[PDB]
Amino acid sequence: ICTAKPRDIPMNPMCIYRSATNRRVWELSKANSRFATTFYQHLADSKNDNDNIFLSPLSISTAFAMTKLGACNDTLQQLMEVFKFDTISEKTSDQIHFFFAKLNCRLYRKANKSSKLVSANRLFGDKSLTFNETYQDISELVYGAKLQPLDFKENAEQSRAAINKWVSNKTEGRITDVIPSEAINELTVLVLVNTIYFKGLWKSKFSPENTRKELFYKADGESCSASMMYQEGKFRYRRVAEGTQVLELPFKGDDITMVLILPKPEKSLAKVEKELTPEVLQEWLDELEEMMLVVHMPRFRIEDGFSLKEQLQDMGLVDLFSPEKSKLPGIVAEGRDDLYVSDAFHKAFLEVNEEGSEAAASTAVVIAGRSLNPNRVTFKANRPFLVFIREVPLNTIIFMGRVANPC
Ligand SMILES: *[C@@H]1O[C@H](CO)[C@@H](O[C@@H]2O[C@H](CO)[C@@H](O[C@@H]3O[C@H](CO)[C@@H](O)[C@H](O[C@@H]4O[C@H](CO)[C@@H](O)[C@H](O)[C@@H]4O)[C@@H]3O)[C@H](O)[C@H]2NC(C)=O)[C@H](O)[C@H]1NC(C)=O
Ligand SMILES: *[C@@H]1O[C@H](CO)[C@@H](O[C@@H]2O[C@H](CO)[C@@H](O)[C@H](O)[C@H]2NC(C)=O)[C@H](O)[C@H]1NC(C)=O
Ligand SMILES: *[C@@H]1O[C@H](CO)[C@@H](O)[C@H](O)[C@H]1NC(C)=O
Structure with missing residues (x-):
């Protein structure tokens, strides 16, 4: 919930890192933007000077914070560093999430409905497994991320197609192919997903x-x-x-x-x-x-779609993607330490016209x-x-x- 105090919501995950309440939100905005800038420049480097580039950096931070909840050690630290959460003035790494949620509250729950700005997060975890119960709860409590059971193990390429259609539904048809072909396999445990839609006049x-x-x-x-x-x-x-x-x-x-x-x-x-x-x-x-x-x-439409791996690796997310060193033991029940991010994708759409903009x-x-x-x-x-x-x-x-x- 948005209307709550810091201690009120018991949002203490597994690990932790070192390192009136409205000023927290604002410090996270500075963090986010610093990531945004830096992420942009690295991404710029990957592309030509003449190539289009479009993205929601807010989206990325959100999805990576969602992921942060079941991170530990050299994965949790890097997550805080890279996404400048280690810039916000607070001593614990679990305090990020209370403010992110409140930022999200301010953004997506306003009385002023001049322009439509909505967001929907969701975890899509394998059907056979059991996910840490505190993990799950905080996920839905802080970000609104319900856990939907899909058959990664057996019917894999249809669950890839069900996540895409879920994104699609939440982005009024604009974002269609988030998850590229052949990225979800038989070993896919969990897929964490963010979604942001804007339309203004x-x-x-x-x-x-x-x-x-x-x-x-x-x-x-x-x-x-x-x-x-x-x-x-x-x-x-x-x-x-x-x-x-x-x-x-x-x-x-x-x-x-x-x-x-x-x-x-x-x-x-x-x-x-x-x-x-x-x-x-x-x-x-x-x-x-x-x-x-x-x-x-111009009256125009741009669409951009990419993986964040190389870029994020470059800024310091090295453990998370590593099969051997990735540390995520808050996700499932036993602490499966074979959890590592295979790849992470992003896809954005911009359309500007006489009447306004849709992103x-x-x-x-x-x-x-x-x-x-x-x-x-x-x-x-x-x-x-x-x-x-x-x-x-x-x-x-x-x-x-x-x-x-x-x-
Ligand atoms: C993403 O998935 C959403 C569901 O999770 C879905 O949203 C729901 O869609 C239905 C549309 O059928 C919404 O219901 C509308 O409610 C009003 C009630 O006032 C109806 O008037 C309206 O029906 C229309 O009205 C006419 C009757 O006078 C009829 O002749 C028209 O043809 C038409 O049916 C609907 O019944 C419901 O509120 C939506 N929200 C939720 C949370 O359920 C989205 O469509 C879907 N979006 C995409 C892009 O896929
Ligand atoms: C789910 O994760 C929580 C933490 O993320 C684990 O619980 C913590 O366990 C230690 C001791 O083992 C306690 O000091 C904490 O207070 C615990 N938290 C809670 C809420 O219990 C928990 O073990 C995990 N559950 C499973 C099934 O793995
Ligand atoms: C990781 O962190 C936990 C507690 O934060 C600690 O118990 C453990 O020794 C650390 N190192 C490794 C290699 O797991």
């Missing part, structure tokens, strides 16, 4: 009479018909250092806003992407002022399946701009991306 619309098809040129040497939108109004805006523009497009309500970032034409995104931090982002935010301006942005994303951590290779199917394109959908009052980057192809 602009605070000020783009009339559809003013949209114009104009052609877009890629770095390879190709053309596509972009659909530019147009509008004129007062918008929080700033031309910052190096001739970079930061424009903010608030949604009906003012609580959630889309924040664009475009570099001076000559320059690339790289410089800005390489120096991108939470501090940097808030600087610009504080700088912005109300301005009469003409906005031209969806999902994260699925898979315990003991296979670890497949990055399945890449995307093309490079020119002149990219960063997008960020954020919740103002609670300092959280919900979605975050780099649009690079508006067709």
Whole structure:
């Protein structure tokens, strides 16, 4: 529950780590964003400069915190480090989860229903096994993560298909193939899943009479018909250092806003992407002022889908993915120490139009399946701009991306 005190909810898991109440929530937002930034940069490195990039970093943190609940030692420590939970001012590693839940409460349970922002988590564990009873309870109590019994052992590729359809249902059709083909096997014990959906209407619309098809040129040497939108109004805006523009497009309500970032034409995104931090982002935010301006942005849809393994390994999640060293003895009943994350996937969808925006994303951590290779199917394109959908009052980057192809 959201309306509760720190001691009230007995959320003491197995392990623990070292290292008014509203300020906890806020410290976790700083943590989350630091992860978000860093995760973004590593992920950027993996991709081309001209490739699209979209994701919910909030989603990832959530799914990995869910996982954290049955972690121990060199798995629990790394989890806190990598996801900057070891930054929040509190001495115990089980205190993260009370605040994450409260953050989640603020995010997904508001009276202000200008824009729709929902989330659904769920554990899908093998049917034959028994899961630690405290584990289970906290999972559902803190995150809302019910445990659904699927037949990993026998009917494997249909349970892969049932988790995907579950995500699909919770993301209004947008997120369809979270779990890639052939990743859930006969040994798959548990699959931890997050889901976030957003849909907002602009605070000020783009009339559809003013949209114009104009052609877009890629770095390879190709053309596509972009659909530019147009509008004129007062918008929080700033031309910052190096001739970079930061424009903010608030949604009906003012609580959630889309924040664009475009570099001076000559320059690339790289410089800005390489120096991108939470501090940097808030600087610009504080700088912005109300301005009469003409906005031209595309009518477009981007979808991004990837594994988090290599990237997260790079930032320090090494034990968790390791078959020999991974430490997760709070999940099942006996302490099965053959629990290790095979692979973890993410998939996001962005759609911006005249009427507003729709964003969806999902994260699925898979315990003991296979670890497949990055399945890449995307093309490079020119002149990219960063997008960020954020919740103002609670300092959280919900979605975050780099649009690079508006067709
Ligand atoms: C994801 O799965 C959800 C269930 O867990 C499911 O949501 C439920 O869907 C039904 C839709 O049939 C919702 O019920 C609606 O309730 C109102 C009651 O006021 C009805 O008016 C409405 O029926 C429509 O109304 C007409 C009758 O005047 C009829 O002619 C129309 O054709 C139509 O049937 C529904 O009965 C229910 O509230 C939903 N929520 C829950 C929690 O159950 C989702 O559809 C599914 N989403 C996706 C994307 O798959
Ligand atoms: C489920 O996990 C809990 C902790 O995550 C385990 O219980 C703890 O066990 C130690 C002693 O063995 C006690 O000091 C703690 O107070 C226990 N917690 C509770 C709530 O009992 C528990 O052993 C696990 N259960 C199973 C079946 O494995
Ligand atoms: C891991 O942590 C538990 C308690 O936190 C401790 O008992 C154990 O010795 C640690 N090390 C290993 C290798 O398990």
